[PDB]
Structure 1
Amino acid sequence: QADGAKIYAQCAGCHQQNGQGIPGAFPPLAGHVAEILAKEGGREYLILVLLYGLQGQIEVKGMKYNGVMSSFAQLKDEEIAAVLNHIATAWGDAKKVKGFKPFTAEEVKKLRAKKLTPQQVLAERKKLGLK
């Protein structure tokens, strides 16, 4: 099973069907996912956000966000890999990532041992050296 586009319905009210988010509220995923994936540790980070959530001040496309995102750990590993592959391809980000590797259920499964808080996920983000 696992249809990333269908699972994305759970994210769309915030990040939007076009992945552009809402400045001042929910960050964009379109365009931005490629930027994260280009960093070493970027794909793991995206999985951590889905498993553990995120909170804290971040900047995305030169705009500031200081909100909270819940964890989606209740989703199956296949579902998380599917929705992450969806946000990586729905708006063309994958083509923009040299050597893009699709997320897999096993990768997600492995990171379930981490047991992080949203603050630890922010600490992981800071190590990517984004903006």
Structure 2
Amino acid sequence: GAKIYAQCAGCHQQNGQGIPGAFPPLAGHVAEILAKEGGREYLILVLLYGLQGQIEVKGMKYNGVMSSFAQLKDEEIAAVLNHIATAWGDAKKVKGFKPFTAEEVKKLRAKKLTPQQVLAERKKLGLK
């Protein structure tokens, strides 16, 4: 569950800062997405389905593509999330959130959505 995050070095970087300019800050930014309910739903989504479509995160906008892995077993995922949700301080800031879990992960394979579909649900939540 951090080893995973490691399987592809780069993208969102060992630091969570990822690498601003091309990948957004998971860095702490995961909280603000983890606050706003469903968020921990939006996140689940992302790795399973993929996301795309110009977006703004901490003002610097992005527009790129990010793939889904949706291969990693509900397990495999389930983790490399409470990992990016804690492993730079976030389970912190955010209220004692219930961690992640696999049934919830297959609970969504269902959804069987798309890179845009997915943005749509990032729309639902907004910002500031």
Shorter-normalised TM-score: what interval?
A: over 0.9
Change (3 A) 1:11 1:31: farther
Residue 85 (str. 1) matches residue 82 (str. 2): yes
Tell me the percent identity: 100
- Residue ranges of structure 1 left out of the alignment (5+ in a row): none
Q: What does residue range 25-44 of structure 1 map to in structure 2 within 5 Å?
A: 25-44=22-41
Give the root-mean-square deviation of aligned CA atoms: 1.1
Instruction: Give the structure with the higher percent strand.
Output: 1
Q: Which has the higher helix share?
A: 1
Q: Considering Cα pairs closer than 8 Å and 6+ residues apart, tell me whether 1 or 2 has the greater RCO.
A: 1
Tell me how far 1:12 sits from its aligned partner. Answer: 3.8
TM, length-normalised to structure 2: 0.95
Task: Structure 2 unaligned segments of length 5 or more: list them.
Answer: none
| Alignment: residue pair count | 128
* Cα shift readout 1:67-92 (whole Å, capped 9, x = no counterpart): 00001101111110110111001100
* Deviation sequence 1:14-65 (CA, Å, 0-9, x none): 1001100222201111110000011011011000101000000111111100
Higher mean Cα deviation, 20-29 or 109-118?
20-29
Shift in CA distance, 42/32, structure 1 to aligned 2, threshold 3 Å: same
Aligned partners of 2:127 and 2:118: how far apart in 1? 14
Give the whole-Å Cα distance in 2 for the aligned partners of 1:10 and 1:104. 20
Paired residues for 1:97-116 under 5 Å? 97-116=94-113
Task: Tell me which of 62, 65, 79 is aligned to 1:65.
Answer: 62
Q: How far 1:11 sits from its partner (Å)?
A: 4.6
Q: Return the alpha-carbon distance in structure 2 between the equivalents of residues 87 and 11 of structure 1.
A: 14
Structure 1 stretches of 4+ with a deviation exceeding 4 A read: none
